[PDB]
Amino acid sequence: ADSCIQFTRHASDVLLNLNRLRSRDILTDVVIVVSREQFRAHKTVLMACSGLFYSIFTDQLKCNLSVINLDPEINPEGFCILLDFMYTSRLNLREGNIMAVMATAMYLQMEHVVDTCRKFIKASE
Template sequence: MEPSPLSPSGAALPLPLSLAPPPLPLPAAAVVHVSFPEVTSALLESLNQQRLQGQLCDVSIRVQGREFRAHRAVLAASSPYFHDQVLLKGMTSISLPSVMDPGAFETVLASAYTGRLSMAAADIVNFLTVGSVLQMWHIVDKCTELLRE
């Protein structure tokens, strides 16, 4: 086999593909693990865009007369309440208690897709209510912490 050419600095240059030695075959029992961390955020971003455009949404949620569309898989994964409604009861249309603020719900729904939640300090109790009803304990915990400060 021909030695690798050297660059002006003396470092070996990569051989052209046709001159490179063939890769060693992996043993049949070998397990190769590959991770694509950007896929998770790209997937949720794509689902959120679909939600915003009303595409492929398969659940309607009503809050004080306002209707919100979402993906049942995202709802079930983000909220034990929605998990029970869409998976155990098979519901595709859900009416939430009138005690819930529609604006706070809309923001919490978006947070299920984005992992981010922004709220005015004056609205923390509204978000605490939404988190409590939907059994989204991470929101309940954060709102409780903010109210104690």
């Protein structure tokens, strides 16, 4: 119907609660391995944020895996920053991490993050 009312804060409240489930390890269903580091998460949140995870978890064989190993070139801190962004909308972008964050966002197919990294890099050159 076109006569709905909308609760402005609903989407951010849902995301805040999903991050609280992640913090408490409630209903996490996959472990992402990035060389020596492991990250627990919810497949649905990963798919809703990343083109790469959407492709992985819609694959008829990979959708059933409980562990996904990322390319060894991926930086664990870069992945950690992007995982936090997925769950909070907040990106901890710093001079010391921007190259790793951009490379990880390109691999994960997160276009809006790639765009802001490119802009911040261009401003410093």
